[PDB]
Amino acid sequence: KREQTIENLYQLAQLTQQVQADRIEIVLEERRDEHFPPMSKALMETRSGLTRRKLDEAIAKMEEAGHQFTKNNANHYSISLSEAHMLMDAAGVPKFHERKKNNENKPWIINVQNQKGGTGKSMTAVHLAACLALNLDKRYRICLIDLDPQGSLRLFLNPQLAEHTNIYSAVDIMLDNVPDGVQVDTEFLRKNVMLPTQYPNLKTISAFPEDAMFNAEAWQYLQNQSLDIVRLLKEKLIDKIASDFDIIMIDTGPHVDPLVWNAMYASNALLIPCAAKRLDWASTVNFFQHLPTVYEMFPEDWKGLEFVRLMPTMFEDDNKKQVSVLTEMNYLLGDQVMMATIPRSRAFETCADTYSTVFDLTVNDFGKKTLATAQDAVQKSALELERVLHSHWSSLNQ
Amino acid sequence: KREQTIENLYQLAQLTQQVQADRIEIVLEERRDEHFPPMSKALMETRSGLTRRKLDEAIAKMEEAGHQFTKNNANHYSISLSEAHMLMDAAGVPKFHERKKNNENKPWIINVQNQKGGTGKSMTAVHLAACLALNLDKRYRICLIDLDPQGSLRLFLNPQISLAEHTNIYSAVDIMLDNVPDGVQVDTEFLRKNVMLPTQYPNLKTISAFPEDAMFNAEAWQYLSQNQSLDIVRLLKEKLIDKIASDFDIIMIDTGPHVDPLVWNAMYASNALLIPCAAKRLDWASTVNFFQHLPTVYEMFPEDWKGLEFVRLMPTMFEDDNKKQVSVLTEMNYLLGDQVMMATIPRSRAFETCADTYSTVFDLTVNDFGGKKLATAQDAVQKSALELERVLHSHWSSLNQG
Ligand SMILES: Nc1ncnc2c1ncn2[C@@H]1O[C@H](COP(=O)(O)OP(=O)(O)O)[C@@H](O)[C@H]1O
Ligand SMILES: Nc1ncnc2c1ncn2[C@@H]1O[C@H](COP(=O)(O)OP(=O)(O)O)[C@@H](O)[C@H]1O
Ligand SMILES: [Mg+2]
Ligand SMILES: [Mg+2]
Known part of the structure; x- marks a missing residue:
């Protein structure tokens, strides 16, 4: 009777072998599409030991290279994380490890x-x-x-x-x-x-x-x-x-x-x-x-x-x-x-x-505070x- | 080198061997705190496969004994789960293994x-x-x-x-x-x-x-x-x-x-x-x-x-x-x-x-x-x-x- 059972499970394996998992497809269906919350100037200043003058100078140095930051008509800035790392690289910070x-x-x-x-x-x-x-x-x-x-x-x-x-x-x-x-x-x-x-x-x-x-x-x-x-x-x-x-x-x-x-x-x-x-x-x-x-x-x-x-x-x-x-x-x-x-x-x-x-x-x-x-x-x-x-x-x- | 780390781990385990797990205390803290939702004659019939006549005869038999049932805000009876299990053996239908x-x-x-x-x-x-x-x-x-x-x-x-x-x-x-x-x-x-x-x-x-x-x-x-x-x-x-x-x-x-x-x-x-x-x-x-x-x-x-x-x-x-x-x-x-x-x-x-x-x-x-x-x-x-x-x-x- 054991033979019958092992045969049946081998049959299930053979019938279902045809389907495999496409990892790229799984990651694609689990795409983020949410856009990490952008930081203001003050949030940038607290996440990065940078003074307002140094941050403004970094924004100037990066804007002189064509890159355009996101601010509104009242100059509130929405700095992405990529812009935030670039501001560090453009600010001379030795970046711990270097x-x-x-x-x-x-x-x-x-x-x-x-x-x-x-x-x-x-x-x-x-x-x-x-x-x-x-x-x-x-x-x-x-x-x-x-x-x-x-x-x-x-x-x-x-x-x-x-x-x-x-x-x-x-x-x-x-x-x-x-x-x-x-x-x-x-x-x-x-x-x-x-x-x-x-x-x-x-x-x-x-x-x-x-x-x-x-x-x-x-x-x-x-x-x-x-x-x-x-x-x-x-x-x-x-x-x-x-x-x-x-x-x-x-x-x-x-x-x-x-x-x-x-x-x-x-x-x-x-x-x-x-x-x-x-x-x-x-x-x-x-x-x-x-x-x-x-x-x-x-x-x-x-x-x-x-x-x-x-x-x-x-x-x-x-x-x-x-x-x-x-x-x-x-x-x-x-x-x-x-x-x-x-x-x-x-x-x-x-x-x-x-x-x-x-x-x-x-x-x-x-x-709010929570x-x-x-x-x-x-x-x-x-x-x-x-x-x-x-x-x-x-x-x-x- | 790692000798000091394994000695530290043995001392970690020895410092805390006192605290045990009282599996009775944790199941008592996890008491039900409420009863099973009682059934109202309809669920009883659907789950038991009993006719309304046989169910009513069995519950009237159980009521003339020392047991008394219980109703809700409406006079319709509100029987619990164990009461229905008692209704079963008090109706004639045996258990599955019986x-x-x-x-x-x-x-x-x-x-x-x-x-x-x-x-x-x-x-x-x-x-x-x-x-x-x-x-x-x-x-x-x-x-x-x-x-x-x-x-x-x-x-x-x-x-x-x-x-x-x-x-x-x-x-x-x-x-x-x-x-x-x-x-x-x-x-x-x-x-x-x-x-x-x-x-x-x-x-x-x-x-x-x-x-x-x-x-x-x-x-x-x-x-x-x-x-x-x-x-x-x-x-x-x-x-x-x-x-x-x-x-x-x-x-x-x-x-x-x-x-x-x-x-x-x-x-x-x-x-x-x-x-x-x-x-x-x-x-x-x-x-x-x-x-x-x-x-x-x-x-x-x-x-x-x-x-x-x-x-x-x-x-x-x-x-x-x-x-x-x-x-x-x-x-x-x-x-x-x-x-x-x-x-x-x-x-x-x-x-x-x-x-x-x-x-x-x-x-x-x-x-x-x-x-x-x-x-x-x-x-x-x-x-x-x-x-x-x-x-x-x-x-x-x-x-x-x-
Ligand atoms: N029909 C369902 N509708 C909504 N959520 C469900 C349904 N079935 C399962 N879940 C959720 O999926 C989880 C599966 O938990 P569990 O069965 O412990 O995992 P596993 O299947 O690995 O043992 C549960 O926490 C439950 O909230
Ligand atoms: N700091 C927290 N505050 C409130 N709920 C939490 C916290 N951390 C985890 N949880 C809840 O407890 C669950 C534990 O998640 P997880 O860390 O994956 O457990 P484990 O690591 O044991 O698998 C999560 O589903 C989450 O909803
Ligand atoms: Mg986990
Ligand atoms: Mg499970």
């Missing part, structure tokens, strides 16, 4: 990981990446790798004609899922992987559900006792891209797989976001218990993890239970927990509903993270 | 599975379970096993209704890994009192899931590497399903978006396969890749495996007026017809309200909006459930022998 002693720097590889789903992990990741990409004084080179096959990071930072076609994911690069005749060159990685977003300096390596096969073709393969699978992501992707980025951030998902193991091995920093709820905190501490027993099995040439941080998410701040849970986090493993939380606001629910960040939204989408406070909270969290990255940076170069 | 026409049935082990998340398989599972439980005439003994560590099937107003006098509450993964007190043995009574919990549907029991269960995969990752045995797929069927089949007509396993050794357990234990897939394009393509991968996995299973008996693709979130989605649905029906189910599930706002309120379309009323939309949604769910029931009654005697 200046001294930081010119020779080992890039940060941050792994956002937790065993519980429904804690703002995937959302904290995109918000952190965007908010760091909005520091126009430094203009960090940021890469966001969606390592969750069920991830939607390709929808929040939508990648981009029909002559730079066929986009491969991280897993695809791990399995050499490429034309048999192509090289693993960095220009290839720059061209049809690591696609640009509505932010000029922030690239995303998108994920697709078909990536899940990696685990299936590795769970059965684990009969071979390899325990070298963890080297795949770092040896096949990161080392080929680390020359181009200052910060790489990896969004994994709520599980423990060979893929999440790759994310752990390639990482040199670990970020653990967890909601201030009792169930989420208990699952996170079970994750804590589990983490070292697996990290030991990693090969000796690991030497990873410069620092580890717990990021409280969805903090209600009026709920006695949630504040008590946060105080427990602070008492048990303090200073390893972050001092900047991310609140529960209707703003982030709107973000999830519209597949965008609070920085892609406008004040007229719902709630968006300003959300953006300021995300900025405080990103600033604390930046302070931690700068503190532990020289220790990362060796 | 009917001597089939008393040695191998129960259905239906496995809902697809390596694409967000295609609405969990909602399909909970609604199928609730609707089949609402067949008051036959009163199937149904068990909904949440095998998704991130599953919330206990939440969907399927509350593990249990008085505060019950010691613990274990998941299916806990029973598989023998994660119970040391002295006790896993008998049908232990599973009955600590594993399968009441749901507010008298004929439906639920096995809960918790995020900690995720670590099962680790318990296999080192098993599969240092040992090429593949005997972990037997854990679900042998440690739980076999010791539990004596109490259920139907068992539905909700799995999760992955293909894992836990999903392997769900596949090995199943005798029926449901593949819900949304009418979206990339959903259909990922389900097709899943199809391509499936037989190469099932072929690795041990030689003691009595097949699958049937497979059904369940379209979900169908938008009815979307040209791309209707094209995809017609492609699904054309390529593997007779194996794709006819009744689909719309993209109704009623299911959005369900996901917002953690309920089923049979639990909430018209006031939660709409109105006609909920009626059409629950009618569609009932139609799909009747189709699956007709399929089950067909292929049943095929596996009653094996």
